[PDB]
C-alpha cells in the first residue's frame, strides 16, 4: 500500500564511492514551496545539483532566500514569457557548468534547461501535461518527438542524465490506479509508448526501475485532493534517465517520499563519477 524508500546506497557495483548527488523536485510554485520549508530541506539533503520544475515564477520575483544557498551558488532559471505563473524550471549547482542552453530548438516555454558538465550532460525537463480531458495530448505527442530528436543529438557527445517531471507513468507498476487511468493525462497509451521511444531512440535507462524492477507502490506525485498522499494513491512521474554508458556509476536513485512542500516529492541520484 504505502512505501518506505530503501536506504541510500552510496557505493557503485564496482565498489567505488559516489561523488555526485543530484536532486530533482517539482515544487508546484517556487514561492509557496519555499515558504513551506523547501529550502531548509534541500539544505539537509545537501545535493551537488538541484533541479526544479513548475517554478511558476519570473526571474523578477525570484526570492532572495535562494541567494542564501552557497552550496548551490550557480543558479540558472528558464521562464515562459507569454504566461506568468505557468511552468518554469531552474538548475542550481555547486560547480558552474561549462555550457548552458535553454529549450530544444523551437523557440518561450520555460521547460528545459541543459547543462554540460566535465563528465556528462544534464537535462532537466518539466514535460507538458496532456491536460484534463486530453486537451493538450496531441501537443504532448509532438513534444515527445521533438524532445527525443533534440536529446539524441546531445547523446552523440557526452553521456546523458535526464531528470525532472516527465508527466508519464511508464508501466502499471508506476501508479496505483493503472486501469482507471489509461484515458487520462499521464497514462494514456500515446504517452506511455512515447516514453519507451525515449528509452529507445537515445537510448536511456530508468535509473530507479533498473535497480528496483519489481518494487511497486513507489510514486513521486499524489494529487492534493482526496487525501491521496495519505493513501499512497500516487504516480511515478519524476525520473532519472541515464545513458547506458553511465549505469556502472549508478550508485542509487531515491524517492524522498517524506519531504513535504508540493504535490510532487524529491528524487535523488548518486553517481560514482
C-alpha positions in Angstrom: 0.0 0.0 0.0 2.3 2.8 1.3 6.1 3.0 0.6 9.2 3.3 2.7 12.2 4.2 0.4 15.3 1.8 0.8 18.4 3.4 2.4 20.9 5.3 0.4 23.4 3.0 -1.4 26.4 5.3 -1.7 28.7 2.8 -3.5 28.6 1.6 -7.1 28.6 -2.1 -8.1 32.3 -1.8 -8.9 32.9 -0.8 -5.3 33.6 2.9 -6.0 32.0 5.6 -3.8 29.6 8.2 -5.2 30.9 11.7 -5.9 27.8 13.4 -7.2 24.4 13.8 -5.5 21.7 15.2 -7.9 18.3 16.0 -6.6 15.2 17.0 -8.7 11.8 18.2 -7.4 8.6 19.6 -8.8 7.9 22.4 -6.4 4.4 23.3 -7.9 5.1 27.0 -7.3 8.6 28.1 -6.3 7.4 30.8 -3.9 5.0 28.6 -2.0 7.4 25.6 -1.8 10.0 27.9 -0.3 7.6 29.2 2.4 6.7 25.5 3.2 10.4 25.0 4.2 11.7 23.5 0.9 15.0 25.3 1.0 15.6 24.0 4.6 15.0 20.5 3.3 17.3 21.0 0.3 20.0 22.2 2.7 19.7 19.0 4.7 19.8 16.8 1.6 23.0 18.7 0.5 22.9 17.9 -3.2 25.7 18.9 -5.6 22.9 19.8 -8.1 19.3 20.7 -7.6 16.8 20.7 -10.4 13.3 22.3 -10.0 10.1 22.1 -12.1 6.9 24.2 -12.2 8.6 27.2 -10.5 5.7 29.4 -11.6 7.8 32.5 -11.0 9.5 35.0 -13.2 13.2 35.9 -12.6 11.9 39.3 -11.4 10.3 37.7 -8.4 12.8 35.1 -7.6 13.0 35.2 -3.8 16.4 36.2 -2.3 16.3 33.3 0.1 17.8 31.4 -2.9 20.9 33.5 -2.6 21.2 32.0 0.9 22.3 28.7 -0.7 26.1 28.9 -1.1 26.5 25.1 -1.9 24.3 25.8 -5.0 25.6 29.3 -5.9 25.5 28.8 -9.7 21.7 29.2 -10.4 20.0 29.3 -13.8 16.3 29.8 -14.5 14.0 29.3 -17.5 10.7 31.1 -17.6 7.9 31.2 -20.3 7.4 34.8 -21.4 3.7 34.7 -22.5 2.1 33.2 -19.4 3.2 34.2 -15.9 2.6 31.8 -13.1 3.0 28.9 -15.5 5.7 26.2 -15.8 9.3 27.3 -15.3 12.4 25.3 -14.4 15.6 26.0 -12.6 19.0 24.4 -12.1 21.2 25.2 -9.1 24.7 23.7 -8.9 27.8 23.7 -6.7 30.1 23.9 -9.7 29.4 26.2 -12.6 28.6 24.2 -15.8 30.7 24.7 -18.9 27.8 25.4 -21.4 24.2 26.5 -20.5 21.3 26.1 -23.0 17.5 26.6 -22.8 14.8 25.0 -24.8 15.1 22.4 -27.5 15.3 24.4 -30.7 11.8 25.5 -31.4 11.8 29.0 -29.8 9.1 31.0 -24.7 8.1 27.7 -22.8 10.4 27.5 -19.8 10.6 23.8 -19.5 14.1 22.5 -20.4 17.5 23.5 -19.0 20.5 21.8 -20.5 23.8 22.0 -18.6 27.1 20.5 -19.9 29.5 19.4 -17.1 33.0 17.9 -17.3 32.0 14.2 -17.5 28.4 14.4 -18.6 25.4 16.4 -19.9 22.5 17.1 -17.5 19.0 18.0 -18.9 16.0 19.0 -16.6 12.5 18.9 -18.0 9.0 19.9 -17.0 7.3 17.9 -19.7 3.9 19.3 -20.9 1.0 17.6 -19.2 -1.7 16.3 -21.6 -4.4 18.2 -19.8 -7.6 17.3 -18.1 -9.8 15.6 -20.7 -6.8 15.3 -23.0 -7.0 18.9 -24.3 -3.2 19.1 -24.9 -2.5 15.4 -25.7 -1.8 16.0 -29.4 0.6 18.7 -28.4 2.5 16.4 -25.9 2.9 13.9 -28.8 4.7 16.4 -30.9 6.6 17.5 -27.8 7.7 13.9 -27.2 9.0 13.6 -30.7 10.9 16.9 -30.5 12.4 16.2 -27.1 13.6 12.8 -28.4 15.3 14.1 -31.5 16.8 17.0 -29.7 18.1 14.6 -27.0 19.6 12.1 -29.3 21.7 14.9 -30.8 23.2 15.6 -27.3 24.0 12.0 -26.6 26.2 12.0 -29.7 28.7 13.8 -27.3 28.9 13.0 -23.6 26.7 10.7 -21.6 23.3 12.0 -20.6 21.4 12.4 -17.3 17.8 13.4 -17.8 15.7 14.2 -14.7 12.5 16.0 -13.9 8.7 15.8 -14.1 8.3 13.7 -17.3 4.4 13.7 -16.8 4.2 10.0 -17.7 4.0 6.8 -15.7 5.7 4.2 -17.8 4.2 0.8 -16.7 1.3 -0.2 -14.5 3.7 -0.7 -11.5 4.4 3.0 -11.7 0.9 4.0 -10.4 -1.7 2.7 -8.1 -4.7 3.1 -10.5 -3.5 1.6 -13.8 -6.9 0.6 -15.1 -8.9 3.7 -14.1 -6.5 6.0 -15.9 -5.4 4.9 -19.5 -7.6 7.6 -20.9 -6.2 10.3 -18.5 -3.3 12.6 -18.8 -0.2 10.7 -17.7 -1.1 7.1 -18.5 -2.6 7.1 -22.0 -1.0 4.7 -24.5 0.5 7.5 -26.6 2.3 9.0 -23.6 3.3 5.5 -22.3 4.8 4.5 -25.7 6.4 7.9 -26.2 8.4 7.3 -23.1 9.5 3.9 -24.4 10.5 5.6 -27.6 12.6 7.9 -25.5 14.3 5.0 -23.8 15.0 3.5 -27.2 16.0 6.4 -29.5 18.6 8.0 -27.3 18.9 5.4 -25.6 18.5 5.6 -21.8 17.6 3.5 -18.8 15.2 4.3 -15.9 17.7 4.5 -13.0 15.1 3.8 -10.4 13.4 0.9 -12.3 16.8 -0.5 -13.2 17.8 -1.1 -9.5 14.2 -1.7 -8.3 12.4 -3.6 -11.1 9.7 -5.3 -9.1 9.2 -2.7 -6.4 5.5 -1.5 -6.6 3.8 1.5 -4.8 6.8 3.8 -5.4 5.3 7.1 -6.5 6.6 10.7 -6.8 3.3 12.5 -7.1 0.0 12.4 -5.3 -2.9 14.7 -6.2 -3.6 17.2 -3.5 -7.3 16.2 -3.4 -9.0 13.3 -1.5 -6.0 12.8 0.9 -4.4 10.7 -1.8 -0.9 11.2 -0.5 -2.2 9.8 2.8 -3.3 6.6 0.9 -0.3 6.4 -1.4 -2.7 6.9 -4.3 0.1 8.4 -6.4 2.1 8.2 -9.6 5.8 8.0 -10.6 6.2 11.0 -12.9 9.7 12.2 -11.7 12.6 10.3 -13.3 16.3 10.0 -13.5 17.1 8.6 -17.0 20.6 7.6 -17.6 22.8 6.9 -20.6 23.7 3.2 -20.7 27.3 4.5 -20.6 26.6 5.6 -17.0 25.0 2.6 -15.3 28.3 1.2 -13.9 28.5 4.6 -12.0 24.9 4.3 -10.8 25.1 4.0 -7.0 21.4 4.6 -6.2 18.3 6.6 -7.3 16.0 7.6 -4.5 12.4 8.7 -3.9 12.2 11.2 -0.9 8.5 10.4 -0.2 8.6 12.1 3.2 9.7 15.6 2.2 6.7 17.8 2.0 6.2 21.0 0.1 4.4 20.2 -3.1 2.1 17.7 -4.8 5.4 16.1 -6.0 8.2 14.7 -3.8 12.0 14.9 -4.3 14.2 12.3 -6.0 17.9 12.0 -5.6 20.5 10.3 -7.8 24.0 9.1 -6.7 26.7 8.6 -9.3 30.2 7.3 -8.6 31.8 9.5 -11.3 
